[PDB]
Amino acid sequence: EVEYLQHEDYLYRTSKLKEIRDLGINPYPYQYTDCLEVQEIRNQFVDNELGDSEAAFRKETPKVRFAGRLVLFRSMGKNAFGQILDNDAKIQVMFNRDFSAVAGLAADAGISPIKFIEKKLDLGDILGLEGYLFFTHSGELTVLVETVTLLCKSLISLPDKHAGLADKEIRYRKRWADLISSEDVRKTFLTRSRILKLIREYMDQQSFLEVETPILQTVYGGAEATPFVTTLQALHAEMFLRISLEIALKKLLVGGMSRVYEIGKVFRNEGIDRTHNPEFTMIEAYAAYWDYNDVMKCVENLVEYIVRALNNGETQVQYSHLKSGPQVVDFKAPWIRMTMKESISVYGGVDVDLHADHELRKILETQTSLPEKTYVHASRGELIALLFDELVCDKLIAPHHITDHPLETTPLCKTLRSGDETLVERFESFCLGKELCNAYSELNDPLQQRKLLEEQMRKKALNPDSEYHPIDEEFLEALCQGMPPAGGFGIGIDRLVMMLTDAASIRDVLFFPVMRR
Amino acid sequence: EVEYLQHEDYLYRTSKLKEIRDLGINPYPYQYTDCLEVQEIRNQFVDNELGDSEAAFRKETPKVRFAGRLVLFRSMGKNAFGQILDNDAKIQVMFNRDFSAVAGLAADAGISPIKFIEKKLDLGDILGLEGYLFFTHSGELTVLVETVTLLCKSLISLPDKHAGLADKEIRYRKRWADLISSEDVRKTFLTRSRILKLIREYMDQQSFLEVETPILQTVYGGAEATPFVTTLQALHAEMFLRISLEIALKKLLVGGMSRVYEIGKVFRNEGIDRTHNPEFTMIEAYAAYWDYNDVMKCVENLVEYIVRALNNGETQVQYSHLKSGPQVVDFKAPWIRMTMKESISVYGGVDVDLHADHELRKILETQTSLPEKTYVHASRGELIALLFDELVCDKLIAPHHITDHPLETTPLCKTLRSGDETLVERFESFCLGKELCNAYSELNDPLQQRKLLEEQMRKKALNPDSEYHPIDEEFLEALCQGMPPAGGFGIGIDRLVMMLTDAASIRDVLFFPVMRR
């Protein structure tokens, strides 16, 4: 049920439409040409020795044309004052009974321009303003309006400027009301767009080529996640939405492209929380002839570059929403490097290699809240990965690279070049307690790759709930063609944006996050 | 059934893995440090003074490191010559019995470096090369190799050069093989990446902000297309993949963002042909206070800019694949502009407003192959659009903007400012007989918007093949909040890429196009 259709404001505003048309005025006209942005006007004349209001009345000061939403209005008799919001910038306007005209309002109309402005316009209407600049004596840049043009008649009132909890929840769907009302929300989303641009700048300077690969595939992989499934009618075929970019980009390495990246939507059909939306944006990037130590430098340099460009060359950022209180994190490279084992000793208090497997499980029972089913029959590598999750991850506030993970954690990474085949040359980057990056010395031994994908699914099929996952033969054939040694990474871009915009929730960095009905 | 695992060449290549490893050489090593690109090497010394082969043997010429795939090889006794392919650039290599060492091959090994190169390496292997540059007597850039490093032992041969129908059809799946064997394929996809980068540069310069909006939504709209459907588990909810970008971006204009664009995947669950893939890339862009004439200029200027950047300032492009023979088209702005009615006269030979509806029907009956069901009861506006489809569209070879479409073709556009409410301020741009762009003076009268969507719903209720499609109430509520007058366009980027890379099919501009099983 659409409630506003019976609201008093909607009925009152719509009844003005016929009145305005009867005056010969189109309430939804076609353009407003030669229209400067309020912010460009500010930048052009704020540092400038403009006249006072009487100079504007004398038409001696600069004449400007601009447009925006009427967000404040006060009638003062012969004069009226208002505020126009244009694309995150505001400017004061002044209407005068003698000076101001309404476009399309005939001289022999039954209503004066100033009365039209008071009675037929409303807060929320979009207006085109042409007039003369001046400074109030308080220094407020103001426009004496010579001609006002109605550009859009709004039919509901402005949103409440200061949302309580319930209004905020609705504005995650009705995002336009958030963008109208909140300077902070507007700035968050402008910064997000700048971050995406800075990423492309950095990768391009490093000679990576940006590509696109399919979201809809007959397979899925390159991560551990439940997929979305859909039906292609033309071929009467089930398709998956990709859970990662990895396999497709690796095929491009085989194809001879030495440095590729993609910034794209990936889809994981799982739970929704402060750091998880089912549709999210990743960059994956791959450079032939690199290993994971090369990738580590690329990832920290990328993030430092973004932060410096946003914060006047500074590398420190304030984040306010951790349960432990406000933090300052420094993204200056190099970030801290630790092995997973080292991080469990330093932050967890457990030297993993001094304990047998049986002793590790007792620590998990006593020092964590993991259910017995999680660790009762897990392997040594799986137990180490669990100790990290529970005793370490939350403590990684400053930027950390965590290196050398158990082989169990992934089938797509080479093992340690030293010969230790129980650990892989993987790292995950953490900041503010949350995972930010995943990177490998990429596996390109086709026989070893097949064996790990075979051993993975035999283990994955041990759980009766994991959807069966057939081996991606096309990928193995591409590796037989020959993939160069390579180093690759994947960064959750929404999470990066949260850290850099002081966003408490991923819902704050997506225009339209997934919401309950 | 994987055929190559039973092929002789797979046995031959895999059998060398043990032999190479028994010599202490890792066939899949971890990196190749400080590796220059062959293109960068060519840029630096091709147009430069360089020594001859004897200078290289004296180690007086520039020393370089690079890597790539061995794609030609010929032994001449003590010398051997080959070609290395690195990301669409090639360089010749020379090996010599006394000068060239193999990384990790011991002196007391049982095989000589030259014999290892001849016998343990194969075409298709990925090699790291360190050596000295020189020019052959014929002037070809060559590297006398001081050390070769095996970076990847390929287990299958280079792709066959003899393409057929069966061969090239598999290449659309096994794209890595296509990329290795075909310079034209590599250049097509390199050009595609440049086009995307050029679009972003142009749009950014016009002050459009790049945004992302969601692919997965609870509604679909903004085009006439069958959607893909999927299921979001966490909410037990049916979702649609978007069929266009339009509604989400319009909501951002309501929110106060003056100029936005998105380059994103959209999904239309329909048929496959030379200009349709179910997943394709669109740019949509919206500018407040513009109309369709402003957009027309923006579109043709955007495309002219792209063409000039790719073609050293020229605006003419050759396209080879039309049934009418090769064409030259000129993307120079301004493009030809005609109304739909004018184009039916100029190209179709019909002057529509001299004819009654029943004469239009009789023209469709006798001059086209449309089934009678399509026109026997169609409205005048629908008859005009069918006359354009059948008698005009294929003849629009040079770039055209076709303006002022019947109202029936879309519910999202303003009618003509002249007061002719049977036509809308829409244009579609055509080149080489195909639609390139769709653009509007955007409809922002909420009452008129609801009326047109209701009329569409009433019409679709009569077609038993289409399921009920509820009106988007959130979109209508945003329009009530108030959208500025605006102009928007959507361009099919894959079709633009086809036109600028002389691609016969959309399958030639997607790395992994949708393929029958």
Ligand SMILES: Nc1ncnc2c1ncn2[C@@H]1O[C@H](CO)[C@@H](O)[C@H]1O
């Ligand atoms: N559902 C999700 N929402 C947001 N970011 C995610 C999600 N799942 C994973 N990520 C991010 O993607 C990266 C690569 O897996 C992770 O390190 C994490 O930052």
Ligand SMILES: Nc1ncnc2c1ncn2[C@@H]1O[C@H](CO)[C@@H](O)[C@H]1O
């Ligand atoms: N299935 C498709 N594949 C590729 N491009 C398409 C497809 N459908 C429409 N387009 C492009 O999208 C634009 C907007 O509808 C069209 O002008 C056309 O260029």
Ligand SMILES: N[C@@H](CCCC[NH3+])C(=O)O
């Ligand atoms: N596909 C990985 C990112 C790249 C990992 C390194 N190859 C992920 O989703 O986590």
Ligand SMILES: N[C@@H](CCCC[NH3+])C(=O)O
């Ligand atoms: N949504 C349109 C493109 C924009 C049309 C102008 N608002 C389409 O898919 O064709």
Ligand SMILES: [Cl-]
């Ligand atoms: Cl509250």
Ligand code: NA
């Ligand atoms: Na016929």
Ligand code: NA
């Ligand atoms: Na129907």
